[PDB]
Design a binder for these strands. Structure first.
Ligand SMILES: C/C=C/C/C=C(\C)[C@H](O)CC/C(C)=C/C=C(C)/C(O)=C1/C(=O)C=C([C@H](C)CC/C=C/NC(=O)OC)OC1=O
Ligand SMILES: [Mg+2]
Ligand SMILES: [Zn+2]
Ligand SMILES: [Zn+2]
Lengths: 4, 108, 87, 1266
DNA sequence: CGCCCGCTTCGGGGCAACCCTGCGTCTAATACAAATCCGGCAATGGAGTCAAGACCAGGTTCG
DNA sequence: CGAACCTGGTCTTGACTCCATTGCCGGATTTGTATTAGACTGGCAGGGTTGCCCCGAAGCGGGCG
């Protein structure tokens, strides 16, 4: 997962 | 009809108090190939010298103790299995026989 | 999974805690403090008779006297009709 | 990376996982294949459930037990060795396995094509010998040393060959002297000379044995020398004996390994940039198949280059271990254990690893160690994707163990199967029963079931009331059902809507939301008007009650999914609350007009007054309660509460007789008066016979001109009156009302004479077998027609069996013909007609053979129904795959293009005959241009809805084209805009700005498919959307002009005569089984044809028509050619749904010339992104890549989406997922299939931020008050 | 005018994916060691627990 | 308004009384490892079905002579  | 199972572990349900926790030290251990791993131990506890760290290999404590590196011998050698069933004179006999054999076979 | 939360039991347990706090605080300050520090209802650890005494500066006998008095007190149908359905 | 997983997912990136990460996730090398201490039943240390690694099995408890409370958390008991923490870290943590010899992940080796095979450029069947330890491979070589030293080296090779020759001629001399002494012994004494020559021949045979040994030794030496000369990396020294003889000589000049470590060494000694530049050169220059293979390798090569990956990750150095909870070992009650079937695979890998480790540490001969490494390779391969190569590893019962590649939940294999979901709570099903006393927005509901759905709600509501001291007593009280719980249940069920699925949920109305109201019994009483939507008769079908919980959920179920708000089908805007089977008959009987009936308007003065007029419907109903007026007798009421028809309105009143309290007289039945009291006040009078088509028209008029809350109430009223007058109809089926046509005998005897003479002619041999069959078939079709004609003319018009059918309620005339009359022909099991044929109506009863012949057709029908309902689901799944990401995103794109619709083509005599299929192509659209009249005034301007009035205005003005917007030309990049989509067929208004119109189109296309009885059917539709080349391919022209026709041997010979002209297009290999197009009359040689006229009969494949006539014609072809099918089966599907589908087909372009802009020729890319690339590249020097439109089928389009998270669930999950990894393709989570999976709220409906972030606060004026 | 020689089309083969035509015991233990456990007390020392009293210090009783 | 006595308890001392709870020691059982000496030296999955895609023949028409 990559938040931002 | 019902069939129930159960993992072999209880489920204690207190509240996750984030404030009142037993204080705890940190001991940084080193493996052999220059790896640093850290372990929160309880305060009153003899920080063990060695440790099977997360990395999977052995892990030593960062300080220097060396109470005993190994203090244990190999299990048994093929040399062992041979020696316990022959005499040194016999082994020397076969050795010198091989010596004469290679000699006469190669250089006449 | 026979080792899961019944999911009515969890909310029931929360309600139990809440009514229990209510009923305990229906009493004086020292009584509630003694009960909680005795049965770990605030820090999860039963604090012994002498530790309760030292946190109140009294004897083990003073602690046991207070707890026994409170114990006889709690055991009323008055203080118990609310609770009894939680078992 | 945000591993804690809370509400924040802007992307979800994949990528091939190197060992430096795999051993960074893990919390400890598991190094003993021990599961549980057989007796204590605790995890073993270093085992596949080791608490020391994976975590504690008991909440906040170490293994030795020296810590047991939350006060000791985050710390690790220094004797037992476990992080004292919550017992669900056994669900999250992972372990690794330090392999002894590296391994190749099977997804990168056995897949087709094999990505290892490409990145190394090796033949996969020569890669398998490399990694599975069957054949060596030279991994490195010291080119300069073999170069410079080669003089001396070949010198020693020559010296060695000459030593060969010395041994050779030594043998030669030996056998020579032996055989010469043999001759000296032969001739020295006398004997049979043939024996002496046998001695010579034996000596010479042994000498040729010598020369044979010499030749073989020379051959072997030459083989080894040539191999050493040509030695270079990536060679396969098969048979290992050349390698054995080799290595000892020149071992210091190269390196030759075997197995996965050899592949690792290669990929280490491998520059991706140089290789990719070589491939760029080859694709730039090399022609032929070489360019194809070079492109195919360049794919993975540029994949590794561009990304920040490294192909070294493909060879797996350390296997990771899934957390213990995801592969549990639970014990059923009673001592038995239930493993997860991965524990066995892991035990195999750990055992083989430890054995390899001990073999190496011991020192073992090369054969055994290679065998062990091969076993390790096979074991890890079975662990990852079972039985991919080899025979799957099996357990008991010869069932293959279920490895990790199979545990993926969605995991579509080559064929798209159903997901089948999650099994929600707050659910329940039952059998349904018709509920004819309910309102439209209600549902029966068994209180014994509502009391279990709403149990938490009722527990709360009766703890608020002082009925129970706690929650616990209320739970037990519901368990006992104490009496007042029911009265509480009513108050909790008030206003709380519940849903009602009905599997199979074909289309959007399968789920609807009613207001639950309690009912005795145990059947979910359903309202009878929604059975047409659910496709639900009451033959035992069962419905499912879900329950909405959240406040937003109740709002959705109340406003979006309520029943009374969903009247019109989303497929074609027709109404589905419309009356049907019973109520249609009811209203038909209620509104018909029976002349000569009781108390009619019988005007004859001079002997008495009129005696027909009734002073109002009140007096009329009083009369009809008495036995004077019949309900249907033509009368003359004097109404004051029903707006008269248009004509009488204009006549008597002029402006508008505001109905309300007026007066006027209309001659009708009383029945029509009671009927028009059902309809609203403002609605005009009807005064017709309420046939089903008329009722559909009336409800359309209502729904398109009135609010929905009035349409619902009027539908409900029509339902009630329909049933009530259905009962008084007397439609009963007594066998004295199945009247047989009284002259059936003579008709049958006539046609039997005809067919008998045909059969006798066959017996004459004048016509063959097939001729007589076809003749008899035609005779009996003629006979069936005559019988049906006679039958229909014989039944009176009030016959029940024909009243039902004529009223449009149910059943076509064929079924009445089969009841009385003739069954006609019965199909053979193969499909042909039986020339018998059946000659008895079911009223007469058949004979044995007759029934046995009928059974053929019956069972064929049922079996084909099964297969057809199974294939329609396949089509629907493909469509929802293709168009899941076509959602309205802008109120208007403001383009100017848009297709033009036919709209009632001119007539030859000179008139506007309305085009037949206007209601689906013209209705519900938004004009692009302005309809002008007489080349004069503007009759309908830009951006109107084209409903009934303006279509009628155009047919009045006499114009037969209207350029109207459509999703084919909506310019918004991210899906369609609205006004190009026109009206949504469900609401009647403009489509809102979240409607997942892609999914609606897919559903509406694949819903009526089950009715697609039938290339000419559902497979025609499917091969159309797939865009294969049909079997009946007919070539289309490429330029106008008369035709170059020819009829060669055993088939035709067609050629195009251009008009410029040029190279005449030659169509040689045609089939005699194909025919010329009859058009404009039939084609013949020398016929001037159009540009893309279809020559032969059949179906032009959309690829060719695309290549010929731009994307416009291919769109117009696909839409029309699907609509041909869906009309032929008598079905309405508004064209915009098919258009929304096709607009996905035509998204991409092919790249014939990359120019010099980052594009692989022969590849596929987006038109918008292609345009963007050229917009960028026109600056910084122009190399505009030559692009061409491609019409690619639905499946390939779906698979080539942008979101790997979605694209992996469609087809070949494993293959899509692995190369999504190799690209390292980050997903952005904009579709629907992604958000639905990861729980995030979907970007559609009420998920978009325009609606999802509304603020809501009381207006200041109301805040002041309270 | 006849002829080669790669380009292009279709066939055939070949293979990946899938499912049922698939789905018995193996000598024998002995000998030795080390570890792990359980079994009974000796140490307790702590944890509970009675009885009495001393603090009183605020009611209720008779003057 | 005061002396005499009861009574809430409020603790506090001393006084004991029992349970756990280390710790040792001694034998049981449990678990791991080493050793057996006539000769013995390469098995069976498994097979059928299906559908899709890669490589070779073969017109075959241009490039060629
Ligand atoms: C983490 C994702 C990795 C890539 C995806 C892979 C490998 C899956 O293989 C395909 C996606 C998928 C399927 C996962 C299933 C999961 C997680 C699961 O257990 C389910 C499930 O089995 C069904 C559902 C929903 C009911 C599916 C509804 C689909 C709607 N599609 C749509 O709205 O049309 C546009 O959710 C799940 O989480
Ligand atoms: Mg049914
Ligand atoms: Zn522990
Ligand atoms: Zn648009």
């Amino acid at each position: 997962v990559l938040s931002s | 009809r019902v069939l129930r199972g159960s993992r072999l572990g209880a489920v204690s349900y207190e509240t996750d108090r984030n404030h009142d926790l037993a204080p705890r030290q940190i001991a940084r251990y080193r493996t052999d190939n220059g790896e640093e791993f850290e372990v929160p131990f309880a305060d009153d506890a003899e920080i063990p010298g060695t440790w099977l760290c997360r990395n999977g290999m052995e892990g030593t404590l960062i300080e220097g103790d060396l109470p005993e590196p190994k203090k244990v011998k190999p299990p048994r050698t093929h040399w062992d299995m041979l020696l316990e069933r022959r005499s040194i004179e016999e082994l020397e006999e076969l050795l010198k026989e091989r010596l004469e054999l290679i000699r006469s076979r190669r250089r006449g | 999974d026979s080792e899961a939360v019944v999911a009515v039991d969890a909310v029931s347990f929360t309600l139990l805690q809440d009514q229990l706090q209510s009923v305990l605080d229906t009493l004086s300050e020292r009584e509630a403090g003694v009960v909680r520090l005795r049965f770990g209802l605030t820090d999860g650890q039963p604090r012994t008779l002498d530790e309760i005494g030292q946190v109140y500066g009294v004897t083990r006998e003073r602690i046991r006297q207070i707890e026994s008095k409170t114990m006889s007190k709690l055991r009323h149908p008055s203080r118990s009709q609310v609770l009894r359905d939680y078992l | 990376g945000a591993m804690l997983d809370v509400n924040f997912f802007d992307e979800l990136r994949i990528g091939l996982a190197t060992a430096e990460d795999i051993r960074q996730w893990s919390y400890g090398e598991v190094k003993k294949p021990e599961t549980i201490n057989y007796r204590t039943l605790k995890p073993e240390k270093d085992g596949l459930f080791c608490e020391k690694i994976f975590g504690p099995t008991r909440d906040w408890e170490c293994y030795c037990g020296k810590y047991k409370r939350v006060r000791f958390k985050g710390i690790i008991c220094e004797r037992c060795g476990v992080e004292v923490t919550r017992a669900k870290v056994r669900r999250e943590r992972m372990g690794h396995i330090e392999l002894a010899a590296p391994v190749t992940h099977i997804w990168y080796f056995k897949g087709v094509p094999s990505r290892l095979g490409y990145l190394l450029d090796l033949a996969p069947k020569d890669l398998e010998k490399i990694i599975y330890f069957a054949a060596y491979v030279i991994t490195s070589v010291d080119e300069e040393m073999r170069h410079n030293e080669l003089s001396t080296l070949e010198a020693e090779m020559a010296v060695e060959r000459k030593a060969v020759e010395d041994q050779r001629d030594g043998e030669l001399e030996a056998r020579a002297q032996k055989l010469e002494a043999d001759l000296a012994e032969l001739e020295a004494e006398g004997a049979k000379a043939d024996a002496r020559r046998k001695v010579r021949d034996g000596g010479e045979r042994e000498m040729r044995q010598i020369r044979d040994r010499a030749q073989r030794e020379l051959d072997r030496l030459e083989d080894i020398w040539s191999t050493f000369t040509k030695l270079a990396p990536k060679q396969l020294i098969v048979d290992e004996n050349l390698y054995r003889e080799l290595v000892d000589r020149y071992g210091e000049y190269f390196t030759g390994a075997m197995g996965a470590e050899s592949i690792q060494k290669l990929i280490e000694n491998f520059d991706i940039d140089a290789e990719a530049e070589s491939l760029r050169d080859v694709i730039r220059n090399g022609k032929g198949q070489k360019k194809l293979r070079a492109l195919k390798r360049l794919k993975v090569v540029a994949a590794f280059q561009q990304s920040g990956n490294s192909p070294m990750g493909m060879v797996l150095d350390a296997v990771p271990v899934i957390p213990p909870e995801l592969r549990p070992m639970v014990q059923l009650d009673g001592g038995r254990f239930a493993t997860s079937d991965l524990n066995d695979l892991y035990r195999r890998v750990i055992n083989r690893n430890n054995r390899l480790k001990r073999l190496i540490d011991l020192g073992a001969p090369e054969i055994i160690v290679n065998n062990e490494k091969r076993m390790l390779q096979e074991s890890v391969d079975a662990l990852f994707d079972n039985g991919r190569r080899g025979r799957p590893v099996t357990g008991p019962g010869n069932r293959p163990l279920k490895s990790l590649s199979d545990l993926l939940k969605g995991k579509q294999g080559r064929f798209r199967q159903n997901l089948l979901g999650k099994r929600v709570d707050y659910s329940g099903r039952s059998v349904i029963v018709v509920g004819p006393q309910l309102k439209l927005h209600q549902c029966g509901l068994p209180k014994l079931m509502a009391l279990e759905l709403f149990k938490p709600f009722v527990m709360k509501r009766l703890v608020d009331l002082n009925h129970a001291q706690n929650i616990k007593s209320a739970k037990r009280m519901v368990e006992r059902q104490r009496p007042q719980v029911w009265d509480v249940l009513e108050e909790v069920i008030a206003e709380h809507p519940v849903l009602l699925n009905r599997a199979p949920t074909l289309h959007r109305l399968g789920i609807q939301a009613f207001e639950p109201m309690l009912v005795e019994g145990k059947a979910i009483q359903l309202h009878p008007l929604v059975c047409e939507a659910f496709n639900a008769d009451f033959d035992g079908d069962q419905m499912a009650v879900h329950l909405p919980l959240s406040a937003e959920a109740q709002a959705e179920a109340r406003i979006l999914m309520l029943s009374s708000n969903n009247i019109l089908s989303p497929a074609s805007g027709r109404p589905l609350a419309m009356p049907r089977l019973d109520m249609v008959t009811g209203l038909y009987y209620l509104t018909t007009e029976v002349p000569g009936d009781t108390g009619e308007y019988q005007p004859a003065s001079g002997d008495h007054p009129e005696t027909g007029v009734y002073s109002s419907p009140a007096e009329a109903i009083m009369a009809a309660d008495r036995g004077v007026l019949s309900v249907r007798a033509k009368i003359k009421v004097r109404l004051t509460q029903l707006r008269p028809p248009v004509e009488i309105e204009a006549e008597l009143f002029g402006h508008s007789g505001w109905q309300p309290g007026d007066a006027w007289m209309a001659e009708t039945t009383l029945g029509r008066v009671m009927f028009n009291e059902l309809l609203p006040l403002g609605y005009p009078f009807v005064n017709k016979q309420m046939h089903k088509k008329v009722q559909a028209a009336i409800i359309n008029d209502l729904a398109e001109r009135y609010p929905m809350i009035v349409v619902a109430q009027t539908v409900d009223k029509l339902k009630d009156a329909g049933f009530y007058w259905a009962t008084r109809s007397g439609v009963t089926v007594s066998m004295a009302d199945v009247l047989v046509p009284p002259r059936k005998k003579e008709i049958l005897d006539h046609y039997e004479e005809r067919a008998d003479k045909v059969e006798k002619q066959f017996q004459r041999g004048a016509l063959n077998h097939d001729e007589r069959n076809e003749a008899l078939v035609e005779i009996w079709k003629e006979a069936t027609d005559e019988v049906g004609q006679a039958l229909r003319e014989h039944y009176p018009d009030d016959n029940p069996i024909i009243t039902i059918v004529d009223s449009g309620a149910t059943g076509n005339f064929t079924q009445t013909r089969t009841l009385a009359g003739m069954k006609g022909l019965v199909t053979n099991p193969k499909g042909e007609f039986i020339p018998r044929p059946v000659k008895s109506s079911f009223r007469e009863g058949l004979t044995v053979l007759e029934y046995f012949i009928n059974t053929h057709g019956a069972r064929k029908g049922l079996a084909d129904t099964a297969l057809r309902t199974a294939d329609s689901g396949y089509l629907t799944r493909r469509l929802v795959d293709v168009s899941q990401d076509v959602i309205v995103r802008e109120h208007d794109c403001q383009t100017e293009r848009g297709i033009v619709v036919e709209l009632a083509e001119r007539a030859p005599d000179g008139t506007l005959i309305r085009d037949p299929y206007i209601e689906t192509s013209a209705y519900a659209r938004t004009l692009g241009t302005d309809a002008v009249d007489e080349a004069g005034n503007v009759i309908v301007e830009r951006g109107q809805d084209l409903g009934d009035p303006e279509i009628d205005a155009l047919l009045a003005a006499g114009i037969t084209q209207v350029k109207v917007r459509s999703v084919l030309t909506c310019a918004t990049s991210t899906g369609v805009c609205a006004t190009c989509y026109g009206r949504s067929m469900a609401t009647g208004k403009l489509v809102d700005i979240g409607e997942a119109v892609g999914i609606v189109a897919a559903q509406s296309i694949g819903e009526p498919g089950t009715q697609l009885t039938m290339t000419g059917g559902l497979p025609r539709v499917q091969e159309l959307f797939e865009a294969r080349v049909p079997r009946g391919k007919a070539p289309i022209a490429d330029v106008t002009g008369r035709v170059r026709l020819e009829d060669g041997e055993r088939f035709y010979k067609i050629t195009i005569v251009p008009d410029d002209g040029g190279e005449e297009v030659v169509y040689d290999k045609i089939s005699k089984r194909q025919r010329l197009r009859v058009f404009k009359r039939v084609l013949s040689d020398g016929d001037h044809v159009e540009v893309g006229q279809q020559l032969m009969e059949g179906s032009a494949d959309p690829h060719e028509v695309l290549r010929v006539q731009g994307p416009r014609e291919v769109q117009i072809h696909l839409v029309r050619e699907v609509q041909e099918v869906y009309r032929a089966q008598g079905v309405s599907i508004h064209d915009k749904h098919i258009e929304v589908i096709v607009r996905q087909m035509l998204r991409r372009v092919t790249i014939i010339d990359s120019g010099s802009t980052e594009f692989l020729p022969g590849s596929l890319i987006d038109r918008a992104e292609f345009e963007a690339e050229n917009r960028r590249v026109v600056a910084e020097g122009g190399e505009p890549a030559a692009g061409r439109p491609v019409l690619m089928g639905i499946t390939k389009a779906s698979l080539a989406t942008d979101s790997w998270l979605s694209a992996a669930s469609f087809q070949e999950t494993t293959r899509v997922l692995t190369d999504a990894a190799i690209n390292c393709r980050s997903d952005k989570l904009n579709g629907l299939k992604e958000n639905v999976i990861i729980g995030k709220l979907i970007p559609a409906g009420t998920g978009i931020n325009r609606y999802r972030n509304i603020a809501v606060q009381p207006t200041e004026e109301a805040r002041a008050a309270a």
